[PDB]
Amino acid sequence: SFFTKLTADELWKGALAETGLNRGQIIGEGRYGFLWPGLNVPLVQTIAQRSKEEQEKVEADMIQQREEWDRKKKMKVKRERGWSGNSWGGISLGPPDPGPCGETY
Amino acid sequence: HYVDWRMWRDVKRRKMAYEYADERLRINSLRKNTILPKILQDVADEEIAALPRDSCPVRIRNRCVMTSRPRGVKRRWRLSRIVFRHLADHGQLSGIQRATW
Amino acid sequence: NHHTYAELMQTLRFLGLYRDEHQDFMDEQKRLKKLRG
Amino acid sequence: VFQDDPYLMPASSLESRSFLLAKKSGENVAKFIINSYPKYFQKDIAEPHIPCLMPEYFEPQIKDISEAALKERIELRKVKASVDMFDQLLQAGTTVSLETTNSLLDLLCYYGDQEPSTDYHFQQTGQSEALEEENDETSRRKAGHQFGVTWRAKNNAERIFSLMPEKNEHSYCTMIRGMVKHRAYEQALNLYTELLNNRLHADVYTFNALIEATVCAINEKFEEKWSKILELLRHMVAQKVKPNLQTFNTILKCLRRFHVFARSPALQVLREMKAIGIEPSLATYHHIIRLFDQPGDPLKRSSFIIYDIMNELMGKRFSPKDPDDDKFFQSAMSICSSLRDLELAYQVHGLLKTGDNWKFIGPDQHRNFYYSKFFDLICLMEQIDVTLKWYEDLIPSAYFPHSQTMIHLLQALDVANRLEVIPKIWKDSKEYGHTFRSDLREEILMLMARDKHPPELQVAFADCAADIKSAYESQPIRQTAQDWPATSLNCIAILFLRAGRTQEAWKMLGLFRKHNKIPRSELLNELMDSAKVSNSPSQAIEVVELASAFSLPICEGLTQRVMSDFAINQEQKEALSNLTALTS
Amino acid sequence: ALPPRTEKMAVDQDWPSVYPVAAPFKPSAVPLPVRMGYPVKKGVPMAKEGNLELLKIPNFLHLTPVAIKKHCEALKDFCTEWPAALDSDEKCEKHFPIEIDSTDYVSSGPSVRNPRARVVVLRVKLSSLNLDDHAKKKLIKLVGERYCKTTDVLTIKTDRCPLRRQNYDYAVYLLTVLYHESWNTEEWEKSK
Amino acid sequence: KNRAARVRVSKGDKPVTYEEAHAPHYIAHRKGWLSLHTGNLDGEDHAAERTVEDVFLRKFMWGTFPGCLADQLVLKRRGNQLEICAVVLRQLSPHKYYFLVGYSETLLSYFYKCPVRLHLQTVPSKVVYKYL
Amino acid sequence: EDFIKKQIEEFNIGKRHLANMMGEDPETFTQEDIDRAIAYLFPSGLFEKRARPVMKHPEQIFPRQRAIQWGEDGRPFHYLFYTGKQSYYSLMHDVYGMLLNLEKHQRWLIKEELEEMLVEKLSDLDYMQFIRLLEKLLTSQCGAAEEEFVQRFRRSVTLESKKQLIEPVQYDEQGMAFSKSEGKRKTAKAEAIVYKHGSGRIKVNGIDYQLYFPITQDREQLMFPFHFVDRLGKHDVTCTVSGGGRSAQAGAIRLAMAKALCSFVTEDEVEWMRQAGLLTTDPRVRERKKPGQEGARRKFTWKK
Amino acid sequence: NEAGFDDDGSEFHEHIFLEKHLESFPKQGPIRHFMELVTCGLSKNPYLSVKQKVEHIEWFRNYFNEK
Amino acid sequence: PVVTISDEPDILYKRLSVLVKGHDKAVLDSYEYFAVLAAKELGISIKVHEPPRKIERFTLLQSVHIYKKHRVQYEMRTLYRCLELEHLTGSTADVYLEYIQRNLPEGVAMEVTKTQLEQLPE
RNA sequence: GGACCUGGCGGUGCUUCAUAUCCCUCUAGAGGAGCCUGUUCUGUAAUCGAUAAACCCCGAUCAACCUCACCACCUCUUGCUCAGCCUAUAUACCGCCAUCUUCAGCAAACCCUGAUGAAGGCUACAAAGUAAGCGCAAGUACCCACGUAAAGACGUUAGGUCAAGGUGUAGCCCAUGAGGUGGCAAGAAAUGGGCUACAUUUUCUACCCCAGAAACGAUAGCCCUUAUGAAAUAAGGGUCGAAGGUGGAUUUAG
């Protein structure tokens, strides 16, 4: 029941259990694909709805963009090793933080 | 699309009680009146006991308009204790304060 | 009645005029569950 | 209609129209969703029943082949469905009654065998606002053509009109009106002759359509068409039908098409109007206004009928009668602007303020034209205090000023020598979205750098010129990569010097060198005066060097000033002598 | 954005014109830096440009004393005057005898069905009846629960028919047929 | 401990608005109500369906102006004039804003069958009363 | 600060705009009228008188931001800057110096008020030592200058007065003299009318005291004020009474007759009977049961 | 509070005097007593209109005859 | 300014008293000012009265599963302000009453109005 | 293994206290009898959850059918639902709470001390601490500034609930899901909490406290009638006329 639904901020707080995800969407994209005139397509004044080929191609582009998104999450970052991997002994933290007394290191 | 099956079971109870209210009303008065012969009622009895057992206003459970919880409902807003607490504590129900007398 | 309510939410989400975060969750979780289950 | 949030206010007329059409989009967009799914909105809660709020059903509910289903499909305006099932009734052999065949031919003649347009028609005024001053004679040839349905020979209307058994006046009338509406003028005239042969009566709308058809007929002289119009009105009187306001307004629209030879017939038509006793409308006055006002007339005695008109029209309150009553006010201020008449402009602004007559402005484009012309004229011949009073009274409450007005808004201030008001109207223009208008920028910059001003006005001018330079810098990568005007560069440079923003003046001397624009001798001479004040021989040599690099004929005098006014070293003296030798 | 109409607006500008109708705040329209909300420990009450507390306040901005005065210039058109029926309650009782209660219960939202808005009660004075001698005894014994003795008022209540106007009809009909049955002498009045 | 509408203290970096900050014991001592409907007074009938529609409006406008409603709405209800005053942010395009205004403006009118009016109030960034 | 300056400008302009929308467009719109105008303009309905809207000069709204203590040389202005408590230590140095030069010649401020005048945070023992030195300076025979020092640090007292408010004598009825007072105790109300002479008579709700009060404890309660003031059979009463019970009604009457007899007895004896405790209301009222208890203070069975 | 809501001009004598729809049987019978009882109940009904009152009457009339 | 003086003599309203129930005394007495000044310049005789507030207090449980001893208590503050109009005309009625009715506040507003119209017996 | 730092503990010292709590004290009870209602145990084909303080008239401000998830029997397959599941895990959680708390601490960011260790940071006639923020306090509700309410952070107890609802993980979809019909709530016993008593400051009647008279105790059991309900639990009358003689240890509340 739409009445028993809830905000996503609340669904994740329960899923993660870290106290003991909708960004790739345009403002009018629907499964039915009734591309509107104030949303998606700009404001000729003609209501319309795309076909079975434009829908499938656009949603295929979207799922591929998700896949590349999970790729940019699942790259590898290169950490220089200090005295061994999984150590901290030769790890170079950066330059010291600029002094609030108008200073620099 | 109903919160649960039990809620959907009452929405069915509500509906066919509301449609089957006139027939039951007529024969029932005929029951608790003292004018017709002792035998002239035995017949009307059949009609009632035979009128289906999902419209008798004895099976209506005033449950929760938002989340099916039978016991713990306040009638004036049709809400359970904790849902009414949630809304009145978030401040979207007018007039409801915290009692400090 | 819960039907006009929830089914209009169904149709308006499928028209893309409504974004419900809850159905986005179940959509996404059921996809990641159909990947393995 | 607009919201009060400063982010959501429209700044321009185009932005306001865009917001309004976006809102109207959201409206027919909710209508489409609700009519597509009526089951979700059938539950009424308000008492009483609000049938303008219950959803509209467009699908035919009667599926059996019946005249009730024909009436349902005609009422739903489904042209193809009505035609197809009328063919179904003819195949079934059911006699279709005369009234419902009449309703079917009514629909067919109204729509021209096409379905009604799914878009509620608010298009076809999408002309750009940058071409409102040239060629209203070719703009007519490409703007008088709505792409309407041309009457095709052998259409469904003609098929029904041939198929039905007993022909009556309403059927013939609707057929003639449909042919006139879809530009079958000769066919409509022939069908009117067939009506006269069949001894039927044509109504007022049919006779007006026939008048329009006779005028729109090709290759006939105005005298012949006028004689035909007189014959049609004689036929009207002989058929005992009484003419009316729309009849005579159609006549007036046609004689407006008939130009100079038709001016006296318009006066005769309005006199016969008043003699028969039907009140002329604002559309009637619009028609004879636009007839008598034609470009190229050397007399303007045709334009004196506007004072005859208002002398009949003061103090009266009007109701809607005719479609061009909203065009009346626009036409008459076209005349007021053309003849440059402040008193008559005020007179019809008063006629507007009488009662509800403000309604007869009508649409937003007409409103913008009306108030633009009114404010132009106020700026052109009124006194500057009442011009600014009308400015604050009308802008932005009544209309959004067009780009041209901005320039004019200034010319009045320049004539009145009230240049102190320049920063506030500049700020208003920038708020209204005139930031990227190069002609405005040029106009305030010349009017602003023409004269030496008191210092507080100078520093306010410095802030304004700084923001103009900021906008010019903050136009990146548009196809109108408008090169920095030398006049604008010179003016902003003179103004920053006058207010004392000397280092900024030196930077845009560098901008002069970057953009290869020739600086002005006055700007130069002010730069030497600033260098004299600052005692900077290097800056003096810099401006001499730029003058020599642009090979200007002031450079010798500038060098002589540098020698006379600064203690210079010998290598700089040698360099300046070499520069003068290069220029010589 | 835009520099607001608040500092565009000056003094002697008509506030009934600025706010015609009841509408929520709109602080950009409002030329008052009104601050609302329990402040922070080392701070001020919250500003005006974004408050929800300044939104949830009913907002009687639309109706200022001067708006009341100018509003009713026009609202003055629609009123006659009362006669010299006099503030004296006995004088209006003499002039117009009966009294009726016929009320509305205005709510707020989608519908206007409050059934209890059909309550109609009628108060009448026998000293305004004036045509009641021994026939009065009849009326009293007939109406049992009414006629409190300290004040001579009869109160008949109707809530038996759904509409208020036919309830008014039931009050007047019961009054007149109670009156006619009271003036109807009956055969068993003597064997008391 | 009471955990009803109390955003707990983080580390001093948690932006929070007046509404969220105040706890339910300040519900009309410092906060007030976000929905002004008359049904919760002494004598009235339809308060239940007013609240059932209330939670609907909150969630419809939450899902229909996706990620731009800064703080929660003010569902006032005078006469048959339901009002959805808002505090929506300044990120989406104004034509999109006017669109969702119109869409709601008519859709809740045909759902609830009365005049429904949205008076948006655009704000640059989500406001902060205190950092918890 | 520029913040303070433009806030000021905005208040002034908005105050004039406030008198326009109202009707006091003449320039002098006082602060009381400002509070009046905003009250109506936007109805509060919030229990906290700070949580309601407001329109004051930015001065009172925004707090006191201390000025910069050093210019563009470094070089801090006050000589006691590196103590961090310039104002407090300058005051202590000054008070010590006046004690010194006075010895060569020969209520109190609260901590928050002193911190407000010094615009600096202060320790309680710092306040205590300041007060101690100031008391040293008044105890010592000081001159008029150091008197104005001690008096700009000392503040007002606002003493109240504890004389019973005497009701006026209403010389009325036909020609008699009475006083009509009131009394309240435990949901009971008693309005009492006492005539100066009359030798004894009560008419509690129409009947006498032996009929409305069959209990001798109630009759003793009704005796109490007279037998204290030695005017037993010398005045007469008539009392209307609502609510309460058999003892609450008698107590409300007792208070009402005492608070009416005050006008007929002398001021020294009205002070005497106030001391005796017949002129003060009894605030002891029934308490409230609590959710989870078995009474107001009574709890249930086992908790430990 | 009663906008619309006409009820075909009930006007006070169709709602509470059901004698015109009573269809008199021999009045001394218990059935006719019932009709007095049910008639007074439908008279004191304000929620039902006259048309549902008369279909309530005809229900009993139909069934009373049916027996 | 369409007036349309029609036909029949007045309905003669005595004591049209408006009882204003609310959740907020500050809205109620602002309303009192709006109606008192309106009746002042209307000419109609108004009087003020405060019908005393009723608190609907009630108890619920605080924890979801157990702990009946720990309870929450909620309350409704219903306050009343009576604004009784005496000696007013029938035409005077649906113009003042109408002005106020349309200009009613939101959820903190009820306007229960009793009318005692006078008449002649028949 | 040696030596420490911090915390907890001590049938750990000194001092100062608790006040309805620590004792001596004051008032009314529990524990003894009957009844009502939970729980354990036994039983049944017959839910689940709470289970020292902080479970035990507890989820229930409430089960004849319904509720209902239990059991029996018989049926349903794109099933009110782009299914469902009251299936398992409260030791994945959100949510809403208990408890210390009838507390006053929790602290970002710095700085110093300790040979730059875990860590520590007190002296007002002053020896290194300064502090935003949360909490008490303050301000509010009720009749006052009093009292009572509300409030009481960080964390503790993997304390309570996947069964209010939502939900991760794992599972079922001939099933663990869906519906219909009928039963499940009995005491060889025990215990928690209440109610009423064992009378004489009592009992019955008037009266609602100036009398007459007596010189006791079931809200259980059986019978009658009524209420509500399709179908009796409740209510009144009748009848009867129990055990019971103010309850040990211990304990509760004020």
Ligand SMILES: C[NH+](C)c1cc(NC(=O)CNC(C)(C)C)c(O)c2c1C[C@H]1C[C@H]3[C@H]([NH+](C)C)C(O)=C(C(N)=O)C(=O)[C@@]3(O)C(O)=C1C2=O
């Ligand atoms: C057997 N112990 C180690 C245990 C285990 C679990 N859960 C698991 O390990 C299961 N994990 C799986 C499901 C296999 C993933 C457990 O989940 C639990 C407990 C302990 C209990 C003890 C409970 C007890 N109660 C019932 C009276 C008790 O003495 C207390 C108490 N504080 O009074 C408890 O702590 C207790 O309630 C409790 O919380 C337990 C568990 O939760």
Ligand SMILES: [Mg+2]
């Ligand atoms: Mg490794």
Ligand SMILES: [Mg+2]
């Ligand atoms: Mg608690």
Ligand SMILES: [Mg+2]
């Ligand atoms: Mg468990």
Ligand SMILES: [Mg+2]
């Ligand atoms: Mg199961």
Ligand SMILES: [Mg+2]
């Ligand atoms: Mg507490």
Ligand SMILES: [Mg+2]
């Ligand atoms: Mg506190």
Ligand SMILES: [Mg+2]
């Ligand atoms: Mg556990």
